[PDB]
Amino acid sequence: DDKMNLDFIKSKIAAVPDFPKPGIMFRDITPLLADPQGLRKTAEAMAQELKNKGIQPTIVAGTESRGFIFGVALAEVLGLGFVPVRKPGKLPRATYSVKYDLEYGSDSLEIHQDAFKVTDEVLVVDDLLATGGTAKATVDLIEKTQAKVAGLIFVMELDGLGGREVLAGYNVSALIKF
């Protein structure tokens, strides 16, 4: 019933060649989302993995936009609140900001300054761990509020692309390796 759930989740993630550009494999979550059980099982497998490692966050954060999807799903299952981590110009009130390099060049992520109390133990959720650059940025953002990162969890991890190594010092979990 733990292994069976993973194989279920795997089976709803379609591999799509050559998106968004030629020479890259894309992992399409949409059949997982559309299945009445897909987000529930995903969120429950994540909660099971956090329980197994003794990670007890007080609040969840997710990046725009698939991080919103898995983050809200898991936050409901854990009974925690959710904080969106956003692209510049979307948050209305005072922000912190972190600039980071990635594939297409560079960009920024933002949170509200009051997203987190000094007391919070923040779980980052995202769909996919690759180079770990967005996750690092997200970590740097959180720490500007004096909250601490309780850990990071991903639906998927791409083998040996360096992400876990960049996030060394933070607890990192992924349900599926590709």
Next chain:
Amino acid sequence: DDKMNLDFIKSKIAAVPDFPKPGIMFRDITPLLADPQGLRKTAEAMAQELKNKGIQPTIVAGTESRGFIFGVALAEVLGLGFVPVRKPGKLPRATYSVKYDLEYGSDSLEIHQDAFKVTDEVLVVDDLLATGGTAKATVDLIEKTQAKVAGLIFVMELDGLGGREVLAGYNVSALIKF
């Protein structure tokens, strides 16, 4: 019992002057999301309003990105899957498209062509009914599939801005009127 829940939701939505540009009052759901019970109560109060109306959807659709957030929480509560309705170029496989007007120009939205089955009755979920443009675009996208629209539900509605009228012939629910 249930007007307590509406009061709690209202109490967590910030009103923010001159955002994104002077003249307009931005409604900010981030304290609602942060609160451990925000999303739970928002989704339960959407479920309650649907059930008052005898509306029983088979799948939930929501627009990027705040539609993802309320859409996913509601879909979890109702035991249904979820379909993201996305900005152009995000979805990896064949899409349908609908160009919609806004203030200064047009934009568009997309869904996978295989998102809904012929048997589906889609609930559209979003944060805010203002003019109805994105809601109506979304209704047109769903109706390019074989599926039908069961209804639309919003957290908030800007009174007499014309959204309901544009959504003539579709059932529309909103928790809070501004």
